Design a binder for this molecule. Sequence first.
Ligand SMILES: OC[C@H]1O[C@H](OC[C@H]2O[C@H](OC[C@H]3O[C@H](O[C@]4(CO)O[C@H](CO)[C@@H](O)[C@@H]4O)[C@H](O)[C@@H](O)[C@@H]3O)[C@H](O)[C@@H](O)[C@H]2O)[C@H](O)[C@@H](O)[C@H]1O
Length: 384
Amino acid sequence: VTLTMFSTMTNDSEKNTLRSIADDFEKENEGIKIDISFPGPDYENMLRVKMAANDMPDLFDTHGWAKIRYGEYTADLKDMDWVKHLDPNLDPILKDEKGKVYAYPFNQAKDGIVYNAGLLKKYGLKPPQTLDELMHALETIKEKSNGSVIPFWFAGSDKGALAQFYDQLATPLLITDDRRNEKKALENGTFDWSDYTLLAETFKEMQEKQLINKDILTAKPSQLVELMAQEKIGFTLSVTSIGPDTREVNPDIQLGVMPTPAVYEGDKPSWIGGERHTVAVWKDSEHLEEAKRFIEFAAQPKYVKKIAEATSFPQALTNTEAENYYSKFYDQYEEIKIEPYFDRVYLPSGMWDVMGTTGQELLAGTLTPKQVSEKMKQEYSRLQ
Ligand SMILES: OC[C@H]1O[C@H](OC[C@H]2O[C@H](OC[C@H]3O[C@H](O[C@]4(CO)O[C@H](CO)[C@@H](O)[C@@H]4O)[C@H](O)[C@@H](O)[C@@H]3O)[C@H](O)[C@@H](O)[C@H]2O)[C@H](O)[C@@H](O)[C@H]1O
């Protein structure tokens, strides 16, 4: 029997690691073969088509939507052994009031911004805690290195790489400042999107002042490691997970990680948390028990550790004696709270693609910042 498995993993390191775990399983389980697909930027649409057809892979990544999008398609995992080791922070995300456990997490999100620590030290820059401090850090980097380095780098041929910027900054913009937020209108379903303009404007000024890569619209995730590894990049969104690979290329580099900065004075930064890579079992799998056996195999301390190390993402289980990759900085920001992804819990499914699409067009010049907010509103209403 062959089990189908789908994953949102796009990093060669992590994908191979997953593959070799799948292989170790196959060699310990005679009847059972595992085929894994990694469609990356096309993942979410492929799974929407599979849900609509009700023809799901046996194992599939839920990538932040286990309950809200995939819930009806998932088998209940609550009786599996690994469950007692789930980091409590994920309890409300992967469990419901019935006791159901919707998916198994390979890791979890703790997303901010990654930077070249040695470069920041060279320009007398502390890690920015506000958007405005970030913009100033970008300006210093540019003029101080005299244009040698790209202050903030985005693989903008990939929509998600741009959506990511908006999605993270929406939190401090619209949610966390209890004096300036839009939770009520978001929970009404009446949010008008005027605030969102600030984000699009910010990105436009970043390209206006050459604070980002000029090849942003053509830049691909492939190219990042190379440039970080040769000290031509100040900042990237932490989700690019390049610290493992760039170290393997150049062990001299001191990278740091910092939370997503605040937008309004008085507000604090936030880590953005929740699911990153998960595997759920299709409720209607013909090999339910085999599919769960893969998960049980994968949840062994050793394989948790393998998969943990293949990224810089923190671990999801409490059972691993291993420290998180950036535990050093996390101690330094023990004060900072964790927020869920803005699009995962405050928006209907669909807004992520619009976020990324409109990020591209802003950069290409097809839309002004105001017209970006307008497209988001239009699509947000359409989704209700
Ligand atoms: O991050 C918030 C986002 O989370 C879910 O999105 C799922 C996501 O899956 C694919 O990307 C996963 C991929 O992300 C990283 O890689 C890149 C390049 O660094 O970053 C982009 C996302 O910011 C991504 O498109 C690029 O591949 C990460 O390093 C890697 O480990 C991950 O496997 C897909 O490409 C992307 O578009 C998304 O569909 C969630 O569904 C979203 O709603 C949102 O909350």
